[PDB]
Write a protein that binds this DNA or RNA. Sequence first.
DNA 1: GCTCTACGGATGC
DNA 2: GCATCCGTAGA
Length: 599
Amino acid sequence: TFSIIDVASDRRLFNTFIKEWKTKERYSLALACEKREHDSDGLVLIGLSVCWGARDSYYISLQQVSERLGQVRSCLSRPGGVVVTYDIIQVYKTLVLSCGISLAGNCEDPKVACWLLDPGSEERTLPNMVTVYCPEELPLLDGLGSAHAHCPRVRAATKSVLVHAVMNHLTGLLEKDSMLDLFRSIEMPSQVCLALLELNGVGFSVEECERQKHVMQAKLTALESQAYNLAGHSFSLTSIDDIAQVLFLELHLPQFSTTKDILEKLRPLHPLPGVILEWRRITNALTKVVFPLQREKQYHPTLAMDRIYPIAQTHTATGRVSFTEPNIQNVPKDFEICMAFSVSMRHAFVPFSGGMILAADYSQLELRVLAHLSKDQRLLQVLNGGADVFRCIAAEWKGVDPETVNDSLRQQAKQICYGIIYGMGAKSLGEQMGVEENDAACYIESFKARYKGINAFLKETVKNCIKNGYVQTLMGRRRYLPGISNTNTHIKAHAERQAVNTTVQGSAADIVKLATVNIQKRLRKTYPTAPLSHQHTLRGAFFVLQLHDELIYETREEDLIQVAQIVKREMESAVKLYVKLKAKVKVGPSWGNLQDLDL
DNA sequence: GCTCTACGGATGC
DNA sequence: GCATCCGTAGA
Ligand SMILES: Nc1nc2c(ncn2[C@H]2C[C@H](O)[C@@H](COP(=O)(O)OP(=O)(O)OP(=O)(O)O)O2)c(=O)[nH]1
Ligand SMILES: [Mg+2]
């Protein structure tokens, strides 16, 4: 039955546990943390629990410790040897930040497996797992502590045995879905990479952020002065009611939806919608970036700099990775204040002293992925010759030379292309393009006619989703879309759009995770003596940010060239598609100041 | 009748 | 009285 052996109680017992632990091809590890403080070994993290089959759990107490932790480090760092933990990122970060132990080897996390089996479902707690997947272990839930009495050793042992059972069931479930090698070769190493990113943080100059904040606040005072002058009274710029009054009630064209439609037929008609738009953009910047970042900032003393530590979400409908605490991914790009000041929220994100930011983006990634999946011969030959499809779309749309395509113009062409691929209608295309309804419909017809393989892939993806109830990515991840067969046409169409989008975007996410893993492997081979993160303590790169197809690394100046070569090679060789996977590598003294490193 | 993500402020029942 | 909702930013 449910047993708790205390191996950290005798020399021979602990040594036998270690020598049996090394041989085991798969165990479950759990952390026992009595959190009187909210990162310390023997003060917060109290112990370690290890479970193999037959409802037995071995608890290693980290109280009194040097030799216990040394042998646990030896086994936990390359003892097979698969460690199963609930919330792998949390466990890895806690181990690093408390006792300086890095989980080296193959990891498994029942959370990641449950998300694999049904990514559109809810994040199941471990109890939630036991009730659903392992009902025969339900009597053990009384013993995962409680909100009042935890007993961290007993809670750890119960969680470890439950995680072992749950992952044993989920392993067979994943093999049935043919997602097991993908789980073990792609998904879990990506989890470790993300935890290592979370440990790294991203450098953050408070001085630069304070400078930007002061300029933005002076600009907001000026903007409020103009807005109260362009209207007449001192209304509220943060109230949609106080905006829909003054707007649409004196001379405008319409509650009333005072949204960024004030760009349309209002920005070129009255200057207050532009002033309101600028005020809203700077207010977004302040209240969603600089105020959160100035309160989320944390001083790294070893690096002698401030850093921001985001939390990776990773439980996503499509396999993407987002972040929680500051929401770093959505930090705005540069924009101009006239007083011309350049608000660069990314310019506040800086490397350590003597360091460089290295950012490697995937060139038109989902175009290439879709060209491979659809086998569209036209797109294959076009983008295998180094062409920029976004540039050519922008040129043929505007009639301008492709070489004279602006970066913002390229963004609109990119949005048009991806929207068309992902089920955008004629009305939305007309809005985003300026053309009429019929013109946008004919544009979509021409897009599907010249890229015949793309239309065939769209139809086949929807047909196979109806026939199977799910869609599959390039590397085998499935998403279930029960609305694909809904009688209501809106839910059915929504599921078809999600089917195509999930296929292509999940495949791109899979490629990006693979590239992250392979870059990490090559970096470890090239600089074996470097620290894994900024919390492990500088040679090589450090992976401070992930941008769904872009990997930010923060390398040393001397290692910049080698790191860029490594990153480019790994990103281009992640997957052998019918397309080439070109990566654009940029270097700079800051995230907001990056120059192309032609290499 | 583009998808995905989070998140501040405001509706909104 | 809080709970989502939505518009917003990235991608
Ligand atoms: N559905 C949709 N997906 C988008 C949109 N913008 C970006 N994404 C997805 C598709 C892109 O392939 C992917 C990576 O983002 P990027 O903006 O960097 O674009 P892409 O890689 O296509 O272009 P690039 O050559 O890097 O400029 O993100 C969008 O407007 N709609
Ligand atoms: Mg890209």
